[PDB]
Amino acid sequence: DVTKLNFQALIDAQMRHAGKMFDVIMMDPPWQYDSLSDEKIQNMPIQSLQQDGFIFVWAINAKYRVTIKMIENWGYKLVDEITWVKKTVNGKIAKGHGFYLQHAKESCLIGVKGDVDNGRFKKNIASDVIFSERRGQSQKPEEIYQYINQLCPNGNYLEIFARRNNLHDNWVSIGNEL
């Protein structure tokens, strides 16, 4: 709605695919385009979307601490963090007595619940930092999708609120390969 989304169709469609819920959830919430209040985001039925696995939630500095609490409340244990270190910078003036502009960054908090000591999930992989392919891109970097794939090869993943790619505004498409 985004107040309302068909999670039930999502739940049943996936329970039929695999007989179990998602391996990884990534959330890219629209913190205050359209926005969602912190409460509405917390209120989402994440607990019914996953029983075992990881949750990845994107937060800027201002929503970092509330994203921790949110993940903890849904029943996860916070165990990792990835930083998108961007090619852009924050504003046009260096902070304090500095000369160079402050780089932009976003944090992705990572929680775990349930049984994840299987070979299904892999430890000691990839890197805890990701990079843009193009300075100023609006879509999240392809490396976060790679690093999730590495974490649970061949698993099932769900993303909620994926940010759009700026480049494709003014494009319509039909017949997309699925």
PDB file of N, CA and C in Angstrom, residues 60-136:
ATOM      1  N   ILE A  60      20.420   4.552   7.388  1.00  0.00           N
ATOM      2  CA  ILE A  60      21.342   5.675   7.465  1.00  0.00           C
ATOM      3  C   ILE A  60      21.638   5.931   8.939  1.00  0.00           C
ATOM      4  N   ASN A  61      22.560   6.863   9.218  1.00  0.00           N
ATOM      5  CA  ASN A  61      22.959   7.153  10.596  1.00  0.00           C
ATOM      6  C   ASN A  61      21.756   7.459  11.483  1.00  0.00           C
ATOM      7  N   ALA A  62      20.805   8.259  10.981  1.00  0.00           N
ATOM      8  CA  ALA A  62      19.703   8.721  11.827  1.00  0.00           C
ATOM      9  C   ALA A  62      18.784   7.582  12.254  1.00  0.00           C
ATOM     10  N   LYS A  63      18.682   6.525  11.453  1.00  0.00           N
ATOM     11  CA  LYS A  63      17.833   5.390  11.785  1.00  0.00           C
ATOM     12  C   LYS A  63      18.632   4.169  12.224  1.00  0.00           C
ATOM     13  N   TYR A  64      19.934   4.322  12.459  1.00  0.00           N
ATOM     14  CA  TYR A  64      20.773   3.179  12.821  1.00  0.00           C
ATOM     15  C   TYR A  64      20.318   2.547  14.136  1.00  0.00           C
ATOM     16  N   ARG A  65      20.159   3.363  15.182  1.00  0.00           N
ATOM     17  CA  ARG A  65      19.845   2.803  16.496  1.00  0.00           C
ATOM     18  C   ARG A  65      18.450   2.174  16.527  1.00  0.00           C
ATOM     19  N   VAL A  66      17.470   2.807  15.876  1.00  0.00           N
ATOM     20  CA  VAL A  66      16.123   2.239  15.838  1.00  0.00           C
ATOM     21  C   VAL A  66      16.093   0.950  15.013  1.00  0.00           C
ATOM     22  N   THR A  67      16.957   0.825  13.997  1.00  0.00           N
ATOM     23  CA  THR A  67      16.989  -0.430  13.247  1.00  0.00           C
ATOM     24  C   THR A  67      17.486  -1.579  14.122  1.00  0.00           C
ATOM     25  N   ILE A  68      18.463  -1.309  14.994  1.00  0.00           N
ATOM     26  CA  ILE A  68      18.902  -2.305  15.979  1.00  0.00           C
ATOM     27  C   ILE A  68      17.719  -2.805  16.801  1.00  0.00           C
ATOM     28  N   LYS A  69      16.994  -1.873  17.429  1.00  0.00           N
ATOM     29  CA  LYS A  69      15.886  -2.228  18.316  1.00  0.00           C
ATOM     30  C   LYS A  69      14.824  -3.014  17.567  1.00  0.00           C
ATOM     31  N   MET A  70      14.552  -2.594  16.334  1.00  0.00           N
ATOM     32  CA  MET A  70      13.554  -3.232  15.488  1.00  0.00           C
ATOM     33  C   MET A  70      13.913  -4.686  15.238  1.00  0.00           C
ATOM     34  N   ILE A  71      15.159  -4.931  14.833  1.00  0.00           N
ATOM     35  CA  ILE A  71      15.630  -6.285  14.573  1.00  0.00           C
ATOM     36  C   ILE A  71      15.594  -7.116  15.852  1.00  0.00           C
ATOM     37  N   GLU A  72      16.009  -6.522  16.975  1.00  0.00           N
ATOM     38  CA  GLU A  72      15.974  -7.255  18.234  1.00  0.00           C
ATOM     39  C   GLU A  72      14.549  -7.645  18.586  1.00  0.00           C
ATOM     40  N   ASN A  73      13.594  -6.738  18.353  1.00  0.00           N
ATOM     41  CA  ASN A  73      12.202  -7.008  18.717  1.00  0.00           C
ATOM     42  C   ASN A  73      11.596  -8.131  17.880  1.00  0.00           C
ATOM     43  N   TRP A  74      11.955  -8.214  16.598  1.00  0.00           N
ATOM     44  CA  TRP A  74      11.491  -9.307  15.748  1.00  0.00           C
ATOM     45  C   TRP A  74      12.112 -10.644  16.136  1.00  0.00           C
ATOM     46  N   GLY A  75      13.001 -10.645  17.125  1.00  0.00           N
ATOM     47  CA  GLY A  75      13.569 -11.868  17.650  1.00  0.00           C
ATOM     48  C   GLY A  75      14.919 -12.265  17.101  1.00  0.00           C
ATOM     49  N   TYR A  76      15.612 -11.369  16.414  1.00  0.00           N
ATOM     50  CA  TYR A  76      16.926 -11.713  15.892  1.00  0.00           C
ATOM     51  C   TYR A  76      18.019 -11.330  16.880  1.00  0.00           C
ATOM     52  N   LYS A  77      19.164 -11.982  16.737  1.00  0.00           N
ATOM     53  CA  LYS A  77      20.386 -11.607  17.400  1.00  0.00           C
ATOM     54  C   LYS A  77      21.279 -10.879  16.386  1.00  0.00           C
ATOM     55  N   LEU A  78      21.694  -9.670  16.720  1.00  0.00           N
ATOM     56  CA  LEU A  78      22.540  -8.876  15.857  1.00  0.00           C
ATOM     57  C   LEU A  78      23.927  -9.469  15.881  1.00  0.00           C
ATOM     58  N   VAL A  79      24.432  -9.824  14.709  1.00  0.00           N
ATOM     59  CA  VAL A  79      25.692 -10.513  14.597  1.00  0.00           C
ATOM     60  C   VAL A  79      26.703  -9.974  13.566  1.00  0.00           C
ATOM     61  N   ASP A  80      26.258  -9.040  12.738  1.00  0.00           N
ATOM     62  CA  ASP A  80      27.103  -8.502  11.686  1.00  0.00           C
ATOM     63  C   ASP A  80      26.595  -7.158  11.148  1.00  0.00           C
ATOM     64  N   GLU A  81      27.454  -6.476  10.404  1.00  0.00           N
ATOM     65  CA  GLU A  81      27.110  -5.229   9.779  1.00  0.00           C
ATOM     66  C   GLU A  81      27.934  -5.113   8.523  1.00  0.00           C
ATOM     67  N   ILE A  82      27.315  -4.604   7.479  1.00  0.00           N
ATOM     68  CA  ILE A  82      27.984  -4.273   6.228  1.00  0.00           C
ATOM     69  C   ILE A  82      27.858  -2.768   6.019  1.00  0.00           C
ATOM     70  N   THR A  83      28.924  -2.137   5.525  1.00  0.00           N
ATOM     71  CA  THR A  83      28.889  -0.712   5.237  1.00  0.00           C
ATOM     72  C   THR A  83      29.010  -0.513   3.733  1.00  0.00           C
ATOM     73  N   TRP A  84      28.033   0.163   3.142  1.00  0.00           N
ATOM     74  CA  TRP A  84      28.157   0.703   1.794  1.00  0.00           C
ATOM     75  C   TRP A  84      28.957   1.996   1.869  1.00  0.00           C
ATOM     76  N   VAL A  85      30.217   1.945   1.448  1.00  0.00           N
ATOM     77  CA  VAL A  85      31.071   3.124   1.392  1.00  0.00           C
ATOM     78  C   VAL A  85      30.913   3.708  -0.006  1.00  0.00           C
ATOM     79  N   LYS A  86      30.317   4.893  -0.081  1.00  0.00           N
ATOM     80  CA  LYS A  86      29.881   5.441  -1.357  1.00  0.00           C
ATOM     81  C   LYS A  86      30.961   6.300  -2.003  1.00  0.00           C
ATOM     82  N   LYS A  87      30.738   6.609  -3.278  1.00  0.00           N
ATOM     83  CA  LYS A  87      31.621   7.491  -4.020  1.00  0.00           C
ATOM     84  C   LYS A  87      31.216   8.951  -3.883  1.00  0.00           C
ATOM     85  N   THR A  88      30.007   9.225  -3.400  1.00  0.00           N
ATOM     86  CA  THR A  88      29.531  10.581  -3.193  1.00  0.00           C
ATOM     87  C   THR A  88      29.975  11.096  -1.828  1.00  0.00           C
ATOM     88  N   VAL A  89      29.633  12.355  -1.531  1.00  0.00           N
ATOM     89  CA  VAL A  89      30.013  12.981  -0.271  1.00  0.00           C
ATOM     90  C   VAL A  89      28.810  13.713   0.321  1.00  0.00           C
ATOM     91  N   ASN A  90      28.951  14.123   1.569  1.00  0.00           N
ATOM     92  CA  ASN A  90      27.863  14.761   2.313  1.00  0.00           C
ATOM     93  C   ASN A  90      28.068  16.273   2.265  1.00  0.00           C
ATOM     94  N   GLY A  91      27.259  16.955   1.467  1.00  0.00           N
ATOM     95  CA  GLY A  91      27.314  18.403   1.408  1.00  0.00           C
ATOM     96  C   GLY A  91      28.558  18.907   0.697  1.00  0.00           C
ATOM     97  N   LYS A  92      28.721  20.215   0.762  1.00  0.00           N
ATOM     98  CA  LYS A  92      29.755  20.916   0.056  1.00  0.00           C
ATOM     99  C   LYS A  92      30.845  21.546   0.917  1.00  0.00           C
ATOM    100  N   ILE A  93      30.824  21.291   2.201  1.00  0.00           N
ATOM    101  CA  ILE A  93      31.809  21.860   3.116  1.00  0.00           C
ATOM    102  C   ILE A  93      32.392  20.745   3.966  1.00  0.00           C
ATOM    103  N   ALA A  94      33.714  20.736   4.113  1.00  0.00           N
ATOM    104  CA  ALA A  94      34.352  19.758   4.981  1.00  0.00           C
ATOM    105  C   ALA A  94      33.999  20.023   6.442  1.00  0.00           C
ATOM    106  N   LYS A  95      33.870  18.956   7.197  1.00  0.00           N
ATOM    107  CA  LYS A  95      33.582  19.022   8.598  1.00  0.00           C
ATOM    108  C   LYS A  95      34.754  19.585   9.389  1.00  0.00           C
ATOM    109  N   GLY A  96      34.472  20.431  10.361  1.00  0.00           N
ATOM    110  CA  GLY A  96      35.508  20.984  11.201  1.00  0.00           C
ATOM    111  C   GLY A  96      36.650  21.691  10.487  1.00  0.00           C
ATOM    112  N   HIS A  97      37.870  21.404  10.905  1.00  0.00           N
ATOM    113  CA  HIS A  97      39.039  22.065  10.350  1.00  0.00           C
ATOM    114  C   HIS A  97      39.623  21.327   9.131  1.00  0.00           C
ATOM    115  N   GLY A  98      38.904  20.333   8.662  1.00  0.00           N
ATOM    116  CA  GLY A  98      39.331  19.492   7.578  1.00  0.00           C
ATOM    117  C   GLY A  98      39.260  20.140   6.221  1.00  0.00           C
ATOM    118  N   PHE A  99      39.940  19.538   5.260  1.00  0.00           N
ATOM    119  CA  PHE A  99      39.889  19.976   3.900  1.00  0.00           C
ATOM    120  C   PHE A  99      39.030  19.130   2.975  1.00  0.00           C
ATOM    121  N   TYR A 100      39.114  17.809   3.112  1.00  0.00           N
ATOM    122  CA  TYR A 100      38.370  16.885   2.261  1.00  0.00           C
ATOM    123  C   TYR A 100      36.931  16.653   2.707  1.00  0.00           C
ATOM    124  N   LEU A 101      36.036  16.539   1.745  1.00  0.00           N
ATOM    125  CA  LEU A 101      34.642  16.333   2.001  1.00  0.00           C
ATOM    126  C   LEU A 101      34.361  14.961   2.616  1.00  0.00           C
ATOM    127  N   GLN A 102      33.341  14.891   3.469  1.00  0.00           N
ATOM    128  CA  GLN A 102      33.018  13.655   4.176  1.00  0.00           C
ATOM    129  C   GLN A 102      32.335  12.673   3.228  1.00  0.00           C
ATOM    130  N   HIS A 103      32.857  11.451   3.144  1.00  0.00           N
ATOM    131  CA  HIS A 103      32.245  10.461   2.265  1.00  0.00           C
ATOM    132  C   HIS A 103      30.881  10.045   2.782  1.00  0.00           C
ATOM    133  N   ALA A 104      29.999   9.705   1.848  1.00  0.00           N
ATOM    134  CA  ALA A 104      28.688   9.173   2.189  1.00  0.00           C
ATOM    135  C   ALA A 104      28.781   7.676   2.430  1.00  0.00           C
ATOM    136  N   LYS A 105      27.943   7.203   3.330  1.00  0.00           N
ATOM    137  CA  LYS A 105      27.863   5.812   3.705  1.00  0.00           C
ATOM    138  C   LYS A 105      26.494   5.451   4.265  1.00  0.00           C
ATOM    139  N   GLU A 106      26.134   4.194   4.141  1.00  0.00           N
ATOM    140  CA  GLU A 106      24.937   3.628   4.746  1.00  0.00           C
ATOM    141  C   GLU A 106      25.319   2.329   5.419  1.00  0.00           C
ATOM    142  N   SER A 107      24.591   1.989   6.477  1.00  0.00           N
ATOM    143  CA  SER A 107      24.848   0.768   7.217  1.00  0.00           C
ATOM    144  C   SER A 107      23.738  -0.235   6.958  1.00  0.00           C
ATOM    145  N   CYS A 108      24.113  -1.508   6.949  1.00  0.00           N
ATOM    146  CA  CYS A 108      23.178  -2.604   6.758  1.00  0.00           C
ATOM    147  C   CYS A 108      23.371  -3.517   7.952  1.00  0.00           C
ATOM    148  N   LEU A 109      22.429  -3.488   8.881  1.00  0.00           N
ATOM    149  CA  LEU A 109      22.495  -4.318  10.065  1.00  0.00           C
ATOM    150  C   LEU A 109      22.083  -5.747   9.757  1.00  0.00           C
ATOM    151  N   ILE A 110      22.729  -6.711  10.379  1.00  0.00           N
ATOM    152  CA  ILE A 110      22.526  -8.116  10.033  1.00  0.00           C
ATOM    153  C   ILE A 110      22.189  -8.898  11.302  1.00  0.00           C
ATOM    154  N   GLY A 111      20.990  -9.487  11.336  1.00  0.00           N
ATOM    155  CA  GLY A 111      20.589 -10.329  12.458  1.00  0.00           C
ATOM    156  C   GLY A 111      20.392 -11.786  12.094  1.00  0.00           C
ATOM    157  N   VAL A 112      20.358 -12.685  13.081  1.00  0.00           N
ATOM    158  CA  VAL A 112      20.190 -14.110  12.827  1.00  0.00           C
ATOM    159  C   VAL A 112      19.201 -14.681  13.843  1.00  0.00           C
ATOM    160  N   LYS A 113      18.370 -15.601  13.397  1.00  0.00           N
ATOM    161  CA  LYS A 113      17.500 -16.359  14.284  1.00  0.00           C
ATOM    162  C   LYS A 113      17.417 -17.801  13.824  1.00  0.00           C
ATOM    163  N   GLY A 114      17.020 -18.686  14.721  1.00  0.00           N
ATOM    164  CA  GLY A 114      16.808 -20.056  14.339  1.00  0.00           C
ATOM    165  C   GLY A 114      18.066 -20.835  14.062  1.00  0.00           C
ATOM    166  N   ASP A 115      17.937 -21.907  13.309  1.00  0.00           N
ATOM    167  CA  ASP A 115      19.018 -22.828  13.139  1.00  0.00           C
ATOM    168  C   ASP A 115      19.789 -22.488  11.871  1.00  0.00           C
ATOM    169  N   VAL A 116      20.999 -22.010  12.060  1.00  0.00           N
ATOM    170  CA  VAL A 116      21.815 -21.653  10.940  1.00  0.00           C
ATOM    171  C   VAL A 116      23.166 -22.341  10.916  1.00  0.00           C
ATOM    172  N   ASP A 117      23.419 -23.230  11.859  1.00  0.00           N
ATOM    173  CA  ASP A 117      24.577 -24.086  11.742  1.00  0.00           C
ATOM    174  C   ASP A 117      24.177 -25.323  10.946  1.00  0.00           C
ATOM    175  N   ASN A 118      24.103 -25.112   9.646  1.00  0.00           N
ATOM    176  CA  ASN A 118      24.103 -26.074   8.565  1.00  0.00           C
ATOM    177  C   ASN A 118      25.151 -25.623   7.566  1.00  0.00           C
ATOM    178  N   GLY A 119      25.484 -26.518   6.640  1.00  0.00           N
ATOM    179  CA  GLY A 119      26.203 -26.060   5.472  1.00  0.00           C
ATOM    180  C   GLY A 119      25.395 -25.121   4.605  1.00  0.00           C
ATOM    181  N   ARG A 120      24.100 -24.957   4.902  1.00  0.00           N
ATOM    182  CA  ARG A 120      23.270 -24.062   4.110  1.00  0.00           C
ATOM    183  C   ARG A 120      23.793 -22.640   4.173  1.00  0.00           C
ATOM    184  N   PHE A 121      24.278 -22.243   5.333  1.00  0.00           N
ATOM    185  CA  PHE A 121      24.805 -20.908   5.543  1.00  0.00           C
ATOM    186  C   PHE A 121      26.306 -20.974   5.774  1.00  0.00           C
ATOM    187  N   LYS A 122      27.030 -20.081   5.133  1.00  0.00           N
ATOM    188  CA  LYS A 122      28.473 -20.126   5.045  1.00  0.00           C
ATOM    189  C   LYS A 122      29.090 -18.986   5.786  1.00  0.00           C
ATOM    190  N   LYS A 123      30.083 -19.313   6.590  1.00  0.00           N
ATOM    191  CA  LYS A 123      30.798 -18.323   7.343  1.00  0.00           C
ATOM    192  C   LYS A 123      32.146 -17.913   6.749  1.00  0.00           C
ATOM    193  N   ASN A 124      32.636 -16.763   7.190  1.00  0.00           N
ATOM    194  CA  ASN A 124      33.926 -16.296   6.762  1.00  0.00           C
ATOM    195  C   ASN A 124      34.005 -16.111   5.262  1.00  0.00           C
ATOM    196  N   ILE A 125      33.163 -15.212   4.762  1.00  0.00           N
ATOM    197  CA  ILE A 125      33.036 -14.974   3.345  1.00  0.00           C
ATOM    198  C   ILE A 125      33.034 -13.501   2.967  1.00  0.00           C
ATOM    199  N   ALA A 126      33.351 -13.242   1.716  1.00  0.00           N
ATOM    200  CA  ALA A 126      33.194 -11.935   1.123  1.00  0.00           C
ATOM    201  C   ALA A 126      33.923 -10.859   1.945  1.00  0.00           C
ATOM    202  N   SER A 127      33.230  -9.755   2.206  1.00  0.00           N
ATOM    203  CA  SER A 127      33.746  -8.601   2.909  1.00  0.00           C
ATOM    204  C   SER A 127      32.623  -7.852   3.605  1.00  0.00           C
ATOM    205  N   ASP A 128      32.962  -7.135   4.662  1.00  0.00           N
ATOM    206  CA  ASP A 128      31.968  -6.359   5.391  1.00  0.00           C
ATOM    207  C   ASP A 128      31.830  -4.942   4.840  1.00  0.00           C
ATOM    208  N   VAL A 129      32.316  -4.704   3.633  1.00  0.00           N
ATOM    209  CA  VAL A 129      32.124  -3.427   2.974  1.00  0.00           C
ATOM    210  C   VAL A 129      31.698  -3.692   1.535  1.00  0.00           C
ATOM    211  N   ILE A 130      30.834  -2.825   1.004  1.00  0.00           N
ATOM    212  CA  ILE A 130      30.447  -2.902  -0.398  1.00  0.00           C
ATOM    213  C   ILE A 130      30.578  -1.523  -1.037  1.00  0.00           C
ATOM    214  N   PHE A 131      30.646  -1.520  -2.371  1.00  0.00           N
ATOM    215  CA  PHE A 131      30.991  -0.342  -3.153  1.00  0.00           C
ATOM    216  C   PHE A 131      30.002  -0.157  -4.291  1.00  0.00           C
ATOM    217  N   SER A 132      29.753   1.103  -4.653  1.00  0.00           N
ATOM    218  CA  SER A 132      29.006   1.394  -5.863  1.00  0.00           C
ATOM    219  C   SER A 132      29.826   1.021  -7.094  1.00  0.00           C
ATOM    220  N   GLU A 133      29.117   0.616  -8.141  1.00  0.00           N
ATOM    221  CA  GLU A 133      29.711   0.489  -9.464  1.00  0.00           C
ATOM    222  C   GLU A 133      29.818   1.845 -10.164  1.00  0.00           C
ATOM    223  N   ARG A 134      28.935   2.794  -9.835  1.00  0.00           N
ATOM    224  CA  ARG A 134      28.879   4.093 -10.507  1.00  0.00           C
ATOM    225  C   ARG A 134      28.546   5.187  -9.500  1.00  0.00           C
ATOM    226  N   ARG A 135      29.352   6.240  -9.514  1.00  0.00           N
ATOM    227  CA  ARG A 135      29.244   7.277  -8.526  1.00  0.00           C
ATOM    228  C   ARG A 135      27.917   7.872  -8.700  1.00  0.00           C
ATOM    229  N   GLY A 136      27.199   7.912  -7.595  1.00  0.00           N
ATOM    230  CA  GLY A 136      25.880   8.445  -7.588  1.00  0.00           C
ATOM    231  C   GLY A 136      24.732   7.524  -7.920  1.00  0.00           C
TER     232      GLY A 136
END
